Scaffold this active site. Structure first.
Site, PDB file in Angstrom:
ATOM      1  N   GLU A  71      18.946   2.142  19.893  1.00 21.70           N
ATOM      2  CA  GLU A  71      18.589   0.844  19.311  1.00 21.70           C
ATOM      3  C   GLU A  71      19.353   0.631  18.011  1.00 21.70           C
ATOM      4  O   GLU A  71      19.246   1.437  17.070  1.00 21.70           O
ATOM      5  CB  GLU A  71      17.075   0.809  19.067  1.00 21.70           C
ATOM      6  CG  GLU A  71      16.484  -0.507  18.642  1.00 21.70           C
ATOM      7  CD  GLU A  71      14.977  -0.401  18.331  1.00 21.70           C
ATOM      8  OE1 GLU A  71      14.173   0.004  19.250  1.00 21.70           O
ATOM      9  OE2 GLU A  71      14.613  -0.709  17.150  1.00 21.70           O
ATOM     10  N   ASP A  99       2.240 -10.073  16.506  1.00 20.05           N
ATOM     11  CA  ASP A  99       1.954  -9.191  17.616  1.00 20.05           C
ATOM     12  C   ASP A  99       1.407  -9.974  18.824  1.00 20.05           C
ATOM     13  O   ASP A  99       0.939 -11.128  18.709  1.00 20.05           O
ATOM     14  CB  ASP A  99       0.977  -8.110  17.169  1.00 20.05           C
ATOM     15  CG  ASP A  99       1.591  -7.164  16.183  1.00 20.05           C
ATOM     16  OD1 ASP A  99       2.709  -6.627  16.460  1.00 20.05           O
ATOM     17  OD2 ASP A  99       0.963  -6.970  15.130  1.00 20.05           O
ATOM     18  N   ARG A 116      17.074 -10.503  11.900  1.00 17.36           N
ATOM     19  CA  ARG A 116      17.787  -9.290  12.288  1.00 17.36           C
ATOM     20  C   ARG A 116      17.794  -9.346  13.799  1.00 17.36           C
ATOM     21  O   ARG A 116      16.862  -9.889  14.395  1.00 17.36           O
ATOM     22  CB  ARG A 116      17.032  -8.036  11.850  1.00 17.36           C
ATOM     23  CG  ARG A 116      16.827  -7.925  10.369  1.00 17.36           C
ATOM     24  CD  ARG A 116      18.181  -7.794   9.632  1.00 17.36           C
ATOM     25  NE  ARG A 116      18.717  -6.473   9.798  1.00 17.36           N
ATOM     26  CZ  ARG A 116      19.962  -6.068   9.579  1.00 17.36           C
ATOM     27  NH1 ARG A 116      20.902  -6.881   9.169  1.00 17.36           N
ATOM     28  NH2 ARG A 116      20.260  -4.792   9.782  1.00 17.36           N
ATOM     29  N   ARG A 126       0.820  -1.207   0.000  1.00 14.19           N
ATOM     30  CA  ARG A 126       0.000   0.000   0.000  1.00 14.19           C
ATOM     31  C   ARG A 126       0.858   1.264   0.000  1.00 14.19           C
ATOM     32  O   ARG A 126       1.894   1.329   0.691  1.00 14.19           O
ATOM     33  CB  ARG A 126      -0.970  -0.027   1.197  1.00 14.19           C
ATOM     34  CG  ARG A 126      -2.137  -1.029   1.000  1.00 14.19           C
ATOM     35  CD  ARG A 126      -2.880  -1.378   2.304  1.00 14.19           C
ATOM     36  NE  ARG A 126      -3.621  -2.653   2.196  1.00 14.19           N
ATOM     37  CZ  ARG A 126      -3.110  -3.875   2.440  1.00 14.19           C
ATOM     38  NH1 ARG A 126      -1.834  -4.038   2.809  1.00 14.19           N
ATOM     39  NH2 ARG A 126      -3.883  -4.952   2.312  1.00 14.19           N
ATOM     40  N   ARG A 149      -1.153   8.571   4.809  1.00 14.47           N
ATOM     41  CA  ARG A 149      -2.483   8.785   5.367  1.00 14.47           C
ATOM     42  C   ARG A 149      -2.913  10.210   5.039  1.00 14.47           C
ATOM     43  O   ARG A 149      -2.208  11.171   5.380  1.00 14.47           O
ATOM     44  CB  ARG A 149      -2.494   8.645   6.875  1.00 14.47           C
ATOM     45  CG  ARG A 149      -2.270   7.291   7.381  1.00 14.47           C
ATOM     46  CD  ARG A 149      -3.282   6.964   8.489  1.00 14.47           C
ATOM     47  NE  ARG A 149      -2.959   7.528   9.794  1.00 14.47           N
ATOM     48  CZ  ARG A 149      -2.501   6.841  10.842  1.00 14.47           C
ATOM     49  NH1 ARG A 149      -2.275   5.538  10.790  1.00 14.47           N
ATOM     50  NH2 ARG A 149      -2.278   7.499  11.969  1.00 14.47           N
ATOM     51  N   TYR A 152       6.508 -13.145  12.356  1.00 18.33           N
ATOM     52  CA  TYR A 152       6.351 -12.002  13.243  1.00 18.33           C
ATOM     53  C   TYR A 152       4.903 -11.985  13.690  1.00 18.33           C
ATOM     54  O   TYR A 152       3.988 -11.916  12.845  1.00 18.33           O
ATOM     55  CB  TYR A 152       6.645 -10.665  12.530  1.00 18.33           C
ATOM     56  CG  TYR A 152       6.470  -9.527  13.500  1.00 18.33           C
ATOM     57  CD1 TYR A 152       7.509  -9.169  14.388  1.00 18.33           C
ATOM     58  CD2 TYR A 152       5.246  -8.871  13.615  1.00 18.33           C
ATOM     59  CE1 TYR A 152       7.344  -8.151  15.327  1.00 18.33           C
ATOM     60  CE2 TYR A 152       5.068  -7.867  14.550  1.00 18.33           C
ATOM     61  CZ  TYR A 152       6.121  -7.511  15.410  1.00 18.33           C
ATOM     62  OH  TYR A 152       5.939  -6.493  16.332  1.00 18.33           O
ATOM     63  N   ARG A 185      16.580   4.089  16.359  1.00 20.72           N
ATOM     64  CA  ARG A 185      15.639   4.888  17.103  1.00 20.72           C
ATOM     65  C   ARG A 185      15.979   4.996  18.591  1.00 20.72           C
ATOM     66  O   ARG A 185      16.814   4.232  19.132  1.00 20.72           O
ATOM     67  CB  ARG A 185      14.223   4.378  16.886  1.00 20.72           C
ATOM     68  CG  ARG A 185      13.912   3.077  17.485  1.00 20.72           C
ATOM     69  CD  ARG A 185      12.604   2.543  16.915  1.00 20.72           C
ATOM     70  NE  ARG A 185      12.316   1.235  17.489  1.00 20.72           N
ATOM     71  CZ  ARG A 185      11.094   0.732  17.658  1.00 20.72           C
ATOM     72  NH1 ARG A 185      10.014   1.418  17.290  1.00 20.72           N
ATOM     73  NH2 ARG A 185      10.948  -0.484  18.173  1.00 20.72           N
TER      74      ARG A 185
HETATM   75  C1  LIG Z   1      11.470  -5.809  18.367  1.00 25.79           C
HETATM   76  C2  LIG Z   1      10.070  -6.356  18.551  1.00 25.79           C
HETATM   77  C3  LIG Z   1       9.065  -5.455  18.900  1.00 25.79           C
HETATM   78  C4  LIG Z   1       7.764  -5.891  19.104  1.00 25.79           C
HETATM   79  N1  LIG Z   1       6.796  -4.971  19.430  1.00 25.79           N
HETATM   80  C5  LIG Z   1       5.507  -5.374  19.624  1.00 25.79           C
HETATM   81  C6  LIG Z   1       4.509  -4.450  19.960  1.00 25.79           C
HETATM   82  O1  LIG Z   1       4.763  -3.252  20.117  1.00 25.79           O
HETATM   83  N2  LIG Z   1       3.206  -4.885  20.134  1.00 25.79           N
HETATM   84  C7  LIG Z   1       2.905  -6.196  19.978  1.00 25.79           C
HETATM   85  O2  LIG Z   1       1.774  -6.561  20.123  1.00 25.79           O
HETATM   86  N3  LIG Z   1       3.867  -7.104  19.651  1.00 25.79           N
HETATM   87  C8  LIG Z   1       5.184  -6.714  19.475  1.00 25.79           C
HETATM   88  N4  LIG Z   1       6.159  -7.657  19.162  1.00 25.79           N
HETATM   89  C9  LIG Z   1       5.830  -9.132  19.202  1.00 25.79           C
HETATM   90  C10 LIG Z   1       5.825  -9.797  20.584  1.00 25.79           C
HETATM   91  O3  LIG Z   1       7.134  -9.740  21.064  1.00 25.79           O
HETATM   92  C11 LIG Z   1       5.417 -11.264  20.435  1.00 25.79           C
HETATM   93  O4  LIG Z   1       4.109 -11.298  19.902  1.00 25.79           O
HETATM   94  C12 LIG Z   1       5.557 -12.099  21.715  1.00 25.79           C
HETATM   95  O5  LIG Z   1       6.914 -12.152  22.097  1.00 25.79           O
HETATM   96  C13 LIG Z   1       5.178 -13.529  21.403  1.00 25.79           C
HETATM   97  O6  LIG Z   1       5.365 -14.332  22.551  1.00 25.79           O
HETATM   98  P1  LIG Z   1       5.796 -15.879  22.436  1.00 25.79           P
HETATM   99  O7  LIG Z   1       5.680 -16.522  23.755  1.00 25.79           O
HETATM  100  O8  LIG Z   1       5.000 -16.600  21.389  1.00 25.79           O
HETATM  101  O9  LIG Z   1       7.335 -15.870  22.000  1.00 25.79           O
HETATM  102  P2  LIG Z   1       8.487 -15.318  22.971  1.00 25.79           P
HETATM  103  O10 LIG Z   1       8.121 -14.060  23.736  1.00 25.79           O
HETATM  104  O11 LIG Z   1       9.581 -15.040  21.962  1.00 25.79           O
HETATM  105  O12 LIG Z   1       8.863 -16.426  24.065  1.00 25.79           O
HETATM  106  C14 LIG Z   1       9.532 -17.602  23.653  1.00 25.79           C
HETATM  107  C15 LIG Z   1      10.139 -18.131  24.931  1.00 25.79           C
HETATM  108  O13 LIG Z   1      10.634 -19.472  24.831  1.00 25.79           O
HETATM  109  C16 LIG Z   1      11.901 -19.564  25.449  1.00 25.79           C
HETATM  110  N5  LIG Z   1      12.677 -20.621  24.796  1.00 25.79           N
HETATM  111  C17 LIG Z   1      13.090 -20.669  23.487  1.00 25.79           C
HETATM  112  N6  LIG Z   1      13.724 -21.817  23.254  1.00 25.79           N
HETATM  113  C18 LIG Z   1      13.756 -22.474  24.428  1.00 25.79           C
HETATM  114  C19 LIG Z   1      14.304 -23.697  24.789  1.00 25.79           C
HETATM  115  N7  LIG Z   1      14.814 -24.428  23.820  1.00 25.79           N
HETATM  116  N8  LIG Z   1      14.186 -24.177  26.101  1.00 25.79           N
HETATM  117  C20 LIG Z   1      13.515 -23.431  27.035  1.00 25.79           C
HETATM  118  N9  LIG Z   1      12.983 -22.221  26.673  1.00 25.79           N
HETATM  119  C21 LIG Z   1      13.115 -21.750  25.402  1.00 25.79           C
HETATM  120  C22 LIG Z   1      12.540 -18.191  25.319  1.00 25.79           C
HETATM  121  O14 LIG Z   1      13.360 -17.978  26.462  1.00 25.79           O
HETATM  122  C23 LIG Z   1      11.332 -17.258  25.275  1.00 25.79           C
HETATM  123  O15 LIG Z   1      11.050 -16.792  26.562  1.00 25.79           O
HETATM  124  C24 LIG Z   1       7.454  -7.243  18.955  1.00 25.79           C
HETATM  125  C25 LIG Z   1       8.452  -8.146  18.581  1.00 25.79           C
HETATM  126  C26 LIG Z   1       9.755  -7.707  18.375  1.00 25.79           C
HETATM  127  C27 LIG Z   1      10.797  -8.713  18.005  1.00 25.79           C
END
Ligand SMILES: Cc1cc2nc3c(=O)[nH]c(=O)nc-3n(C[C@H](O)[C@H](O)[C@H](O)COP(=O)(O)OP(=O)(O)OC[C@H]3O[C@@H](n4cnc5c(N)ncnc54)[C@H](O)[C@@H]3O)c2cc1C
Ligand SMILES: Cc1cc2nc3c(=O)[nH]c(=O)nc-3n(C[C@H](O)[C@H](O)[C@H](O)COP(=O)(O)OP(=O)(O)OC[C@H]3O[C@@H](n4cnc5c(N)ncnc54)[C@H](O)[C@@H]3O)c2cc1C
Ligand SMILES: O=c1ccn([C@@H]2O[C@H](COP(=O)(O)OP(=O)(O)O[C@H]3O[C@H](CO)[C@@H](O)[C@H](O)[C@H]3O)[C@@H](O)[C@H]2O)c(=O)[nH]1
Ligand SMILES: O=c1ccn([C@@H]2O[C@H](COP(=O)(O)O)[C@@H](O)[C@H]2O)c(=O)[nH]1
Lengths: 383, 383
Positions: free
Chosen positions: A300, A350, A249, A173, A177, A348, A279
């Site tokens: 960052e 949220d 990244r 897109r 805006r 990715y 940022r």
């Molecule tokens: C830079 C960045 C900015 C973001 N900003 C936003 C935002 O503003 N708003 C939003 O809604 N979302 C945002 N997100 C996304 C958000 O971080 C995720 O949606 C959330 O982390 C997902 O949670 P999860 O449990 O699925 O994965 P994770 O939070 O990544 O948790 C995975 C966990 O498993 C553990 N693990 C991995 N492998 C092993 C292993 N082999 N043994 C034991 N433990 C292990 C890790 O320690 C980790 O704690 C952002 C993501 C990034 C990367």
């Protein structure tokens, strides 16, 4: 009948799935390799300033899914908050995403919405019919000057490649805006957990049938002590990276403490390549119902993700996508396991989407027990 | 015992007093001279576009009073709405109220908050001990350049007086902000009723004990029929304007329809004295949760309130205040009447203050009934 469940990961995926099944009488063992819960949502108070810092970067809750909203509101008080990003480039400060104020300000005009559509359509380079590169989809859309001011330098810093080297697919897109709304997000629900995500996830984790162990790596040999495994670690790692490591990244955060108000907003992007950070985030701006004289900030930096780094953004270009397929074929032949999460499925996601996916995954598992059917290895589309 | 009560006016003042007493079994008679309820809070839909229009001017709810906030939440769904005013002057668009973005755009800098305090402290004149006029307030804190761009011309149009002739308090109210927050209002609670103020007020009015007669002027000889009268019409009018008319500013709202988004925001201030209208308001933007293709807009002109104009802003200088006293001394010699509201007491009152005052006045009459004591003419300070 109570099943034994291993969940790898104490972020939202692990927690929400864990809680859903604990509530239906299952024995849930949740482990995480880190020394705290929360995965990449973890926040914590800096001791010197008392600022609630987003340890793995700014985490803004936003959603159009009220089920999810009601659900987190069971575990936190959501404070209203709307993300309003600023950007410094060319000796000016602008608001982001590109809106009518950005355009007027950048061009020193006084355009109405329609006049600004016209103005952008002249600036657009239609001296190129089938745009192939990211560079050329932007240039078609918004013209040389804006592309160079707000996109080209940012993209290079964030992705580590020229936008000429990147595909036109990235920008579906026209990124303008044509009104003065400078809220980063369009979602119905937006806010910040009053006591932070760590407390929210702690709450989610608080059930008699959930046991958490930290500082604890998954070991394949454990699989056989459980009826089912939900794995929210990296899909490639599960398989010993046998075909190679999936591309990400990574980000480095240079923390500093400012005595006062360092920049006056939560996030200040720096669009220029000649600024080595991407940022600056001033974390206290995420908790505007609190006041703090001392401020924690983060410069960052974005880099290519290497073996010792935390993975952030998945690259998901042709090589990485072909690599993922090979791991998918391995995964599809697996048996008492479901892979979930940004890391388990190479996407990715949220927070709100992660929560919606975790509730569904639990639901499907629960229905799998009652209907006597196989639990799928993925609960969402992965191809 | 169930008292017979007459209330003159179906705006907030009348509605809220009426409703507090109905609920205490009193027989409440509310007349309004207009053919619909709501007072100047009245909104209705335009036929052509279906945009909900704020008929007597855009009306934004804002309060730090939780009780009032709770109160109106009993009678409407409050949608969150944050007012973000833009301003056109000198060939550019700026954000108001003056904040870090305004300062950086106006003077071509990229200051931090502390650098902006320094920049503006050098522009202001701290040799002014105690600013008395609007002009002095401005020269003291914002400086000549900001003053003249944003305030002098606008203020001359709104008030029809040089700012040297106006009180400092007018400007004293507005935030000079050294961060990037462009919320026009500090108030903790801020919003717009989902179904508009007419419905909200309808609901306040909707009790068994309340009868509402529209297209109905007040007549002095009715007083005899009632135990007490609450009067929210203009105080000078109640007395036949026998001493002269209280000074007001009036507003002309010049309507037009545009097929599209005309300015892209609810309110655009025009700060140049050479632009005749004070602002343009685009009402659909007050209902961001709705979508409309056509748009109702108002150019808004300020001029001295004459005989057949609707009074909006009270002037309240020494002259108008002398005149007020004359009417005050007649009103004090009244027996079963309390004058309330912006018109009844010659004050500018925001909706939330109006409602708090209505709540209090209703309390004061009920308290007085139990303690067989006389109900006073004003439940609020006015001399
Ligand atoms: C830079 C960045 C900015 C973001 N900003 C936003 C935002 O503003 N708003 C939003 O809604 N979302 C945002 N997100 C996304 C958000 O971080 C995720 O949606 C959330 O982390 C997902 O949670 P999860 O449990 O699925 O994965 P994770 O939070 O990544 O948790 C995975 C966990 O498993 C553990 N693990 C991995 N492998 C092993 C292993 N082999 N043994 C034991 N433990 C292990 C890790 O320690 C980790 O704690 C952002 C993501 C990034 C990367
Ligand atoms: C331009 C403008 C903008 C404003 N914007 C805001 C805002 O954004 N937010 C906010 O909180 N407040 C705002 N206010 C103030 C808000 O309008 C008032 O708080 C509210 O109108 C007070 O209601 P009221 O019932 O006391 O008086 P009114 O609403 O004026 O009601 C008086 C009623 O009495 C009737 N009446 C008068 N005389 C007679 C008579 N002789 N016989 C029968 N009926 C009679 C009239 O028809 C009218 O309906 C604004 C005010 C103005 C003027
Ligand atoms: O661009 C501006 C804005 C305000 N002022 C001065 O500051 C005073 C107070 O301003 P404001 O807070 O805007 O109150 P009003 O302009 O009197 O009120 C109008 O503008 C508000 C801002 O949108 C709305 O909330 C109200 O409903 C509307 O009556 C004005 O009278 C002006 O003299 C300026 O000089 N320039
Ligand atoms: O103002 C902007 C908006 C987008 N992008 C680039 O475009 C990519 C994706 O665009 P979007 O469709 O997510 O806005 C982002 O990673 C970033 O590289 C910018 O550089 N500046």
């Amino acid at each position: 009948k109570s099943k034994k469940i291993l969940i790898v990961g104490a972020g939202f995926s692990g927690a929400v799935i864990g809680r859903q099944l604990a509530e239906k009488g299952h024995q849930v063992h949740i482990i995480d390799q880190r020394d705290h819960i929360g995965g990449n949502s973890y926040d914590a108070r800096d001791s010197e300033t008392n600022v609630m810092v987003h340890v793995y970067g700014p985490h803004i809750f936003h959603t159009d899914n009220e089920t999810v909203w009601n659900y987190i509101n069971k575990h936190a008080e959501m404070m209203p908050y709307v993300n309003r990003v600023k950007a410094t480039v060319n000796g000016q400060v602008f608001s982001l995403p590109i809106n009518l104020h950005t355009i007027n300000q950048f061009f020193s005009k006084t355009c109405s919405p329609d006049e600004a559509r016209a103005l952008i359509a002249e600036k657009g380079d239609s001296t190129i019919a089938d745009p192939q590169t990211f560079e050329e989809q932007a240039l078609r859309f918004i013209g040389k000057e804006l592309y160079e001011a707000f996109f080209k330098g940012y993209t290079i810093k964030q992705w580590g490649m020229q936008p000429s080297e990147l595909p036109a697919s990235i920008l579906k897109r026209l990124p303008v805006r044509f009104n003065y709304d400078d809220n980063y997000f369009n979602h119905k629900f937006q806010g910040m957990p009053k006591c932070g995500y760590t407390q929210m996830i702690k709450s989610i984790l608080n059930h008699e049938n959930i046991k958490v162990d930290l500082q604890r790596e998954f070991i394949v040999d454990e699989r056989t002590h459980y009826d089912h495994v939900f794995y929210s670690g990296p899909l490639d790692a599960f398989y010993g990276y046998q075909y190679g490591r999936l591309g990400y990244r990574t980000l480095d955060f240079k923390k500093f403490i400012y005595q006062g108000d360092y920049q006056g907003c939560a996030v200040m992007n720096y669009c220029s390549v000649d600024v080595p950070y991407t940022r600056i985030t001033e974390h206290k701006y995420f908790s505007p119902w609190e006041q703090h004289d001392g401020s924690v900030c983060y410069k960052e930096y974005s880099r290519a993700c290497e073996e010792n780094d935390i993975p952030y953004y998945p690259i998901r270009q042709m090589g990485e996508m072909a690599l993922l397929e090979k791991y998918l074929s391995l995964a599809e032949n697996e048996t008492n396991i479901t892979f979930v999460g940004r890391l388990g499925t190479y996407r990715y996601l949220d927070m709100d989407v992660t929560i919606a996916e975790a509730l569904k995954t639990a639901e499907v598992y629960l229905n799998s027990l009652t209907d006597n059917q196989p639990m799928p290895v993925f609960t969402v589309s992965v191809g």
